[PDB]
Design a protein around this ligand. Structure first.
Ligand SMILES: CC(C)=CCSP(=O)(O)OP(=O)(O)O
Ligand SMILES: [Mg+2]
Length: 297
């Protein structure tokens, strides 16, 4: 029991430390209402991971981006969903806003089978312009064609975007403080399938050659299907964070983030998000960089 109490206190502080290291590097003052998210992550006592992210738009650095992944081995997905939604409710109460839950409600709608969930996340992207701040949730489903269809119906709709339907497992939800909400579906290719002839035919053929180069350093590739008809956002799961500069042509602002994280006590892998057109450039101007740390008993 004494072991358990010490570990719990330690995990609480390590989570706050990871959040504070990120915030203090990039924002002299924390963006309101970050402490609410801090309270949320410290309330999650089972195993989890945290994500800290920067979104770069030329010289603009957006850095109050944090996400928790529920990783407790018991996989009580409905409980974590309820914990996340209660946190969303506290944000609503404190800030004085009403969140638009309709897309999530419709997704869950008809008798949701939580045994089909494999990933659940909850987090924030906070801005000084309240209306542009958002809450975030991702749900990964496995062997659930009914809910894949539903997510597709909820997003943009018919072909194309439909051309990568059979590759979708992750669904994302954004909930803006102004009452606007969005859904996104993500097509994926895992490492073991990169060189399969059908994958070149179904996937790689429809992307420029520059899009294919970071796959050498990646274990996973995602693309967002509903937003931006041309110029989709491409996501790369780099096995080693050190490989970023070898595969992506970073501007000054993104270099600063990369430099900060090179020698932080974080997980070796990262995610990199960038629009297709950016990889065709001599220099990336718009990029998302995601860093991770695990918190286990
Ligand atoms: C799914 C991956 C790899 C990253 C999160 S993409 P998102 O749409 O949830 O977040 P942002 O658009 O980067 O704020
Ligand atoms: Mg997004």
């Amino acid at each position: 029991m004494i072991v358990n109490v010490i570990q719990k206190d330690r995990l609480k502080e390590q989570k706050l430390q990871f959040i504070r290291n990120h915030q203090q590097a990039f924002d002299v003052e924390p963006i309101y209402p970050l402490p609410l998210f801090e309270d949320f992550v410290t309330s999650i006592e089972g195993d989890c991971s945290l994500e800290a992210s920067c979104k770069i738009e030329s010289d603009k650095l957006i850095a109050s981006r944090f996400l928790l992944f529920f990783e407790d081995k018991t996989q009580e997905w409905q409980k974590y969903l309820h914990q996340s939604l209660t946190f969303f409710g506290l944000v609503e109460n404190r800030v004085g806003v009403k969140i638009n839950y309709s897309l999530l409600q419709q997704f869950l709608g008809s008798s949701f089978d939580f045994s089909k969930v494999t990933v659940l996340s909850a987090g924030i992207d906070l801005r000084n312009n309240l209306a542009e701040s958002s809450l975030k949730m991702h749900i990964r489903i496995k062997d659930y064609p009914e809910k894949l269809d539903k997510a597709f119906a909820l997003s943009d709709g018919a072909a194309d975007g439909n051309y990568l339907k059979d590759f979708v497992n992750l669904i994302g939800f954004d909930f803006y403080f102004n009452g606007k909400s969005e859904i996104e579906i993500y097509a994926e290719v895992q490492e073991d399938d990169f060189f399969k002839p059908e994958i070149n035919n179904l996937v790689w053929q429809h992307f420029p050659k520059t899009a294919l180069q970071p796959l050498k350093a990646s274990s996973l590739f995602f693309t967002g299907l509903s937003k931006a008809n041309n110029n989709p956002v491409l996501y790369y799961h780099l096995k080693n964070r050190q490989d970023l500069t070898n595969y992506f042509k970073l501007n000054d602002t993104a270099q600063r983030v990369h430099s900060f994280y090179q020698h932080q006590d974080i997980l070796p892998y990262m995610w990199v998000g960038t629009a297709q057109k950016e990889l065709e450039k001599t220099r990336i101007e718009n990029i998302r960089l995601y860093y991770y740390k695990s918190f286990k008993m």
